[PDB]
Design a protein around this ligand. Structure first.
Ligand SMILES: CCC(C)(C)C(=O)C(=O)N1CCCC[C@H]1C(=O)O[C@H](CCc1ccccc1)C1CCCCC1
Length: 107
């Protein structure tokens, strides 16, 4: 599944709804700490619409539990991420992924 561990609290009131665009900053790592990507390195938040099926299930389920302003670590099991396929060249098969995600804004 997806485990959400808070790094910094959000407002505890404004939670993303299906159809809303979440603007997030993230660092994705494997369990050993190995960073595979970060929007913080790009200095450009990543946007996705909740419910559009355009990010992995662990993000849909994990970011919907976060309130605006919250920074959290999302540990996502393979079946909530890329399962057996992995992602060609970047994520191996059956990889648990760890994301540091900051929910910046909802548009
Ligand atoms: C693998 C891309 C990488 C390394 C940059 C990354 O850190 C990542 O893993 N991301 C991108 C940031 C949102 C979370 C995740 C994702 O949902 O990607 C979706 C993949 C969509 C998908 C969902 C479910 C099953 C398969 C695929 C993409 C966002 C657009 C860019 C490509 C990745």
């Amino acid at each position: 599944g997806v485990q959400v561990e808070t790094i910094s609290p959000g407002d505890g009131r404004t939670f993303p709804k299906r159809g809303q665009t979440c603007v997030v900053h993230y660092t994705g790592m494997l369990e050993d700490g190995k960073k595979f990507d970060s929007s913080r390195d790009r200095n450009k938040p990543f946007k996705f619409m909740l419910g559009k099926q355009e990010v992995i299930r662990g993000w849909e389920e994990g970011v919907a539990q976060m309130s605006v302003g919250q920074r959290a670590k999302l540990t996502i099991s393979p079946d909530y991420a890329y399962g057996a396929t992995g992602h060609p060249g970047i994520i191996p098969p059956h990889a648990t992924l760890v994301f540091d995600v900051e929910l910046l804004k909802l548009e």
